[PDB]
Structure formats: C-alpha cells, structure tokens
Design a protein around this nucleic acid. Structure first.
Ligand code: ZN
Ligand code: ZN
Ligand code: ZN
Ligand code: ZN
Ligand code: ZN
Ligand code: ZN
Ligand code: ZN
Ligand code: ZN
Length: 233
DNA sequence: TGCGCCCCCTGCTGGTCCT
DNA sequence: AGGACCAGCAGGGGGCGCA
C-alpha cells in the first residue's frame, strides 16, 4: 500500500518518506538543530552539510585548478567554467547561460515590464540591478583616504561623485574675469591681449571729431583750434 | 534514513555596451 | 571615457526520487 499525504496529492513508498514530506511542506518541524547557530533542518544530511560551512571543510577538489567545494553539485557547476558549457537556454531569445539563476535574471531584466528599479539615496540616478547600485555606492559615494585633486583647479575631494560633479561644473566656464570690464577669456593668451587694449584709456573725447585725449588741456586746445564756434574765414 | 541531484536564492566580479 | 549593463560565478539552503 502506498502512503498518501493527508493534505496534498503526494504518495510515497515508505512511511518515513511521508513523515519527511509533511515536515518539509506541511508541519515545518525541523528536529535537528546546529550546535553553533540557529540552523535547523528536516534531515540530518542537510545539517551535516550546514556544519561543513562552519568548519570550512572542502573535500571535493577540482582536477583542473585549486578550487575545492563543500558540495558535489558545486564542483559540477564549477566545471562549466573550464568546459565553457552553457546548458541553460533562454526560451525567447535562445541565449546560452551557465547557471539557471543567470537565465532567471536575464528573462527578468530583458523580457519583463514594470521592473522595480532602484534609486540612489544620495544622487538622482536609477539602476536596473540591485547589486549594481552597490557598485555605484562603493565607487561613487565612498570616502577615499587619499584625496584626488581636481584636473582643472587646486581643490581636492575625497568622494568620486563630488569630484566629477565639480569637474563637470567647469564646462563653458571662463577662467579669467578681466577686472577692468565684463570680458571673460579661456585661452589665457587672449586675456593678456585684452589687458593691452585697456592701457590706451584716453578718457576725454571730442564732441565734433573722433580724436581722444588723456588731458583736458589737450582736448580744449584741439577744440579751440579745429572746432572754434566763432571762427571767421 | 542516507544521499545524490537539481532546483532555489543571493551578491559580487570583470568584460561589454551605450551615451 | 566612464559607468551601467550583463553574464559569469561561487556561497548557503530546500524537497524528493532512489537506494
Ligand atoms: Zn503533503
Ligand atoms: Zn550552524
Ligand atoms: Zn577548476
Ligand atoms: Zn532572452
Ligand atoms: Zn549615487
Ligand atoms: Zn575644479
Ligand atoms: Zn577688460
Ligand atoms: Zn575735434
């Protein structure tokens, strides 16, 4: 007589298999507890596997490289890196993948809509993968003990994002102000040339011809000669 | 019950692609 | 260039078909 599960359509050869199944899916009773953490498992084999994680024992060793695993399947999975075997194939684009989890990620990102994308808490950027947001946080926003100087100025920064933000702030910016007027140069040579143009001030100018003079006396004697209002031929 | 077998999930890594 | 992208890749863990 087969042993039938009371709560579902499962049949087992022996009573032990049935009580094991009910513990896994129905009662969630895990009687084998670890002596070092809170882990409990339905089977002793799972607990013994979990203990290998505590002790770090790696009995299965790869015949190609130095890799050793705590499980046989992990070593089989590792062999795909040497063999280049890509068993799992996408059922839409027929793309090859090494692991089933990799394929699950692919169909999520490249074949599903309304995907929850993550926003950076510090800057206004959106990232598809959660782990890539971690890469963004570790690279852009993490403190740096050795400050990096600005390529354009002498300010120094300890955060990559602030440095790039400030470096981007020098776009279309004129490094020279030309105190005497509103001119603004960027080539550092036109500013020298513009400085020379200001030297010939000549504030005084004639009201009847284009000539200009540095001294009021020079202007007036020019005016009294060329532009006399009561000249008689 | 033991255990291999496969599937989960998670998250970092290093080359690729898009602006 | 530079950074998101994308698959590669290894960690711990679940259920059960077979012995
Ligand atoms: Zn059941
Ligand atoms: Zn433990
Ligand atoms: Zn290897
Ligand atoms: Zn696909
Ligand atoms: Zn950010
Ligand atoms: Zn700067
Ligand atoms: Zn000027
Ligand atoms: Zn004049």
């Amino acid at each position: 007589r087969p042993h039938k599960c009371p709560d579902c359509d499962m049949a087992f050869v022996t009573s032990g298999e049935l009580v094991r199944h009910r513990r896994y899916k129905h009662t969630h009773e895990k009687p084998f507890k670890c002596s070092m953490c809170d882990y409990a498992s339905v089977e002793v084999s799972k607990l013994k596997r979990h203990i290998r994680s505590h002790t770090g024992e790696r009995p299965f060793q790869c015949s190609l490289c130095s890799y050793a695993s705590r499980d046989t399947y992990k070593l089989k999975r590792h062999m795909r890196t040497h063999s280049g075997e890509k068993p799992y194939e996408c059922y839409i684009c027929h793309a090859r993948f090494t692991q089933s989890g990799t394929m699950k990620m692919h169909i999520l990102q490249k074949h599903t809509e309304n995907v929850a994308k993550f926003h950076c808490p510090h800057c206004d950027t959106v990232i598809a993968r959660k782990s890539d947001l971690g890469v963004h946080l570790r690279k852009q926003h993490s403190y740096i003990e050795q400050g990096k100087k600005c390529r354009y100025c002498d300010a120094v920064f300890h955060e990559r994002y602030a440095l790039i933000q400030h470096q981007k702030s020098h776009k279309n910016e004129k490094r020279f102000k030309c105190d005497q007027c509103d001119y603004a140069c960027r080539q550092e040579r036109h500013m020298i040339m513009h400085k020379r143009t200001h030297t010939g001030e000549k504030p005084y100018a004639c009201s009847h011809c284009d000539k200009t003079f540095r001294q009021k006396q020079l202007l007036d004697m020019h005016f009294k000669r060329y532009h006399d209002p009561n000249f008689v031929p």
